[PDB]
Amino acid sequence: HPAQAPLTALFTSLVWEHPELPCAQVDLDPAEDPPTVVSLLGQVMRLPGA
Amino acid sequence: VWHALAEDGRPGAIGGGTGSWLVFSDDPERAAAWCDELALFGVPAVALAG
Amino acid sequence: WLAARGARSVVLAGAESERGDLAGARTTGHAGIERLEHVAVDLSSAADVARLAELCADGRPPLRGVLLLPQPVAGGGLDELDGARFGAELAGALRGPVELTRRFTDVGLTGGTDFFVLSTSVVSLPGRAGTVVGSAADAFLTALARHHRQAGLPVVAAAWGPWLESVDESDEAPAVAFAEAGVYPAPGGEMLDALLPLPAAG
Amino acid sequence: YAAGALSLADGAALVTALGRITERVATGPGASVWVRATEDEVRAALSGSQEQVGAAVAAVDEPGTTVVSGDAGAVARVAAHWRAHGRATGAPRPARLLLSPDDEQAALAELRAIVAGLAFREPEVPLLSTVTGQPVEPAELRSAEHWLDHLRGPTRFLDGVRRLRTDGVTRLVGLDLSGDLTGPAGRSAAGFGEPGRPLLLA
């Protein structure tokens, strides 16, 4: 969906400009049911950095 | 290129009671649902809306 | 490059074409080209972009290939950026290619064409500091190209490096900054050679 | 038995004895419910007004719910009060704690000689108990006052699972024939210790 594009831009805009802060982008399927929030946060806390 | 995490793809634990998680969404029902889910797992959370 | 690849009929679609020193461009355009023209179209206007439909309807041979070239976008990190500025500058960065790609598809100039290439930077694959609006523009065009490609149209977004011919002899410093970051220029004709044969076949 | 501390004969004696005490509780006038409030919140509400005294914190299976059991009159008015504060609450089920200190004398009339008749031996590996949340010592295991605390006191399952994960247990296997114990294990384990340290449940 083209209207999502500012989210991918803003993610990379953080990665190079506040480089001490950890962050991640997760892209969901837009039509399947969304997963349990503990699955999302769980796999994200395994990344140091970005 | 997208690589599947078929190797080691298991979530692991959330990092203990160091502080709250803030959830903001376009949908109040989604924000509330994830705040209920984090409560079941003993993680403190706050719901935010526009 | 179009001359080197034997393009017999060529048209330039941008406001620069009747205010810049294009006599050198027309002079290299003496090779291989049998008909050469300039529209002086303002691509910000949908009514003026629609005037480009005459270029396929006229007694000249029909339109079969399109190249929208790289564009300037101003500097900006996340600081000095806000919900008033962003909605102006992202619109400015995208208005042209979006309205052209739309109108050309609405009246069959798209699909009635073997290649249709939209410019973006290779720097936008990992992204970079100080270029937020340009990153957003390249992301949006990367999505818009796929939307039409899945419909059966040979539209491609090219994330190119800097064109070597675009390194101004008056000021190498924009290339020096990128050279330290490890992005190096290449000839635009060689980047076109490595991509423009592909969209109908891969 | 799995820890090697009892023979199959000792285990068969002890289970069949504890079963008869369990009948006397299950057949009684009392009740139990679950409320989506933590031990501090429910133990505070236990003091917050005098009308609701008569039921107690029977289990701590997870951070998110605790079990209230005792007199059916206390159970009913506790359950209403938390829906008025805005939490979710289960329907009533049978009693899960002793209902009189007379029942303690009814149990102590049974377990003492039976427990003293078991051929206990020192554990091969650490045995954790929902009466303690801690390793049982060889001098403690031999006392009928340990085994009777399952009917008297809180079922402290969360504190047991927490000591498994402080003590380096990476993977946690569930013999889920009744009570679905792998579910409470995952929800009590997955929010404590370092981030991203492994946790397998099956």
Side-chain angles (χ1 to χ4, degrees):
Chain A
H1 303 299
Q4 295 288 293
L7 297 178
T8 59
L10 179 57
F11 166 79
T12 181
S13 305
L14 295 156
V15 168
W16 302 110
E17 298 189 19
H18 296 83
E20 74 273 41
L21 300 181
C23 76
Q25 187 193 347
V26 186
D27 189 57
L28 307 181
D29 184 292
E32 296 179 328
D33 297 344
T36 306
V37 73
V38 177
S39 306
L40 296 172
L41 293 186
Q43 186 58 24
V44 168
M45 293 205 84
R46 292 180 62 212
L47 284 169
Chain B
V1 176
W2 289 101
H3 293 268
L5 303 180
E7 277 61 49
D8 72 84
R10 289 168 192 75
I14 291 172
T18 62
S20 71
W21 284 78
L22 301 188
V23 182
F24 183 103
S25 180
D26 289 328
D27 291 346
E29 57 270 25
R30 187 61 57 207
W34 288 0
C35 294
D36 298 334
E37 288 171 38
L38 291 174
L40 301 184
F41 282 78
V43 178
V46 175
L48 305 96
Chain C
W1 184 84
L2 285 176
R5 305 293 158 254
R8 287 179 60 249
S9 177
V10 180
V11 185
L12 276 68
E16 197 69 4
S17 64
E18 291 292 358
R19 67 185 188 204
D21 189 17
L22 277 85
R26 292 188 288 269
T27 300
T28 187
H30 296 176
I33 318 187
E34 293 181 29
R35 186 172 186 155
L36 178 60
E37 296 190 4
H38 306 343
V39 193
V41 62
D42 179 356
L43 298 184
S44 72
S45 169
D48 297 84
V49 166
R51 198 186 294 114
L52 302 171
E54 297 191 349
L55 305 176
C56 194
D58 187 25
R60 75 189 74 194
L63 173 64
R64 296 292 179 256
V66 176
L67 171 57
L68 275 71
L69 291 171
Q71 293 201 319
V73 182
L78 294 174
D79 293 326
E80 295 85 60
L81 186 65
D82 68 31
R85 181 181 171 205
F86 184 91
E89 295 192 8
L90 181 62
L94 289 174
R95 180 175 292 127
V98 175
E99 289 301 334
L100 190 156
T101 304
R102 182 192 63 78
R103 175 56 185 209
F104 276 49
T105 306
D106 292 345
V107 307
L109 299 174
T110 318
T113 269
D114 298 345
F115 65 87
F116 185 105
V117 184
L118 297 176
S119 293
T120 60
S121 184
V122 74
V123 177
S124 300
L125 301 179
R128 198 173 182 274
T131 66
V132 179
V133 178
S135 176
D138 289 357
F140 188 103
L141 295 173
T142 301
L144 181 61
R146 283 194 57 68
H147 175 74
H148 292 296
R149 186 62 155 168
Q150 292 184 230
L153 303 171
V155 175
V156 176
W160 282 319
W163 287 37
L164 175 63
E165 48 266 85
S166 304
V167 182
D168 183 358
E169 301 77 11
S170 322
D171 184 12
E172 198 170 348
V176 175
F178 277 15
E180 289 309 322
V183 178
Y184 301 106
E190 186 162 27
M191 294 190 285
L192 294 173
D193 275 346
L195 180 60
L196 272 65
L198 191 57
Chain D
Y1 169 80
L6 279 82
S7 71
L8 173 58
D10 307 313
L14 185 56
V15 171
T16 57
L18 290 167
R20 294 186 296 248
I21 293 164
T22 304
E23 295 271 7
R24 297 174 198 129
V25 176
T27 51
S32 62
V33 289
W34 74 88
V35 177
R36 205 183 305 291
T38 207
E39 180 177 18
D40 296 345
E41 292 177 320
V42 177
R43 198 177 299 284
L46 237 301
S47 181
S49 286
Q50 305 304 349
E51 296 191 337
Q52 59 67 66
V53 177
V57 180
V60 186
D61 298 320
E62 58 172 39
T65 56
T66 56
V67 178
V68 171
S69 188
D71 179 353
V75 167
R77 71 210 304 175
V78 170
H81 169 55
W82 281 107
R83 293 192 296 269
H85 193 266
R87 300 297 179 79
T89 65
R93 294 298 181 262
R96 290 183 60 147
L97 297 173
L98 301 188
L99 300 176
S100 175
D102 307 314
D103 312 336
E104 187 199 67
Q105 314 324 299
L108 288 170
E110 179 149 26
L111 286 168
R112 280 180 292 154
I114 298 175
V115 170
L118 307 178
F120 296 108
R121 61 185 296 283
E122 283 57 53
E124 300 299 335
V125 290
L127 189 176
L128 305 189
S129 167
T130 54
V131 157
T132 63
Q134 293 291 357
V136 181
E137 294 296 339
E140 293 178 319
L141 191 71
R142 293 177 169 92
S143 182
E145 294 279 30
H146 174 76
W147 299 92
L148 184 51
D149 281 350
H150 286 281
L151 299 309
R152 290 190 286 222
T155 311
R156 301 205 71 83
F157 180 80
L158 181 144
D159 293 309
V161 177
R162 292 288 178 87
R163 186 166 174 166
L164 294 172
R165 288 193 66 79
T166 56
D167 303 6
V169 175
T170 286
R171 56 180 74 106
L172 189 60
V173 182
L175 291 156
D176 310 309
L177 288 156
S178 180
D180 196 24
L181 195 59
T182 194
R187 297 196 296 267
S188 61
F192 176 88
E194 295 75 34
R197 188 184 290 281
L199 172 57
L200 168 63
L201 295 129

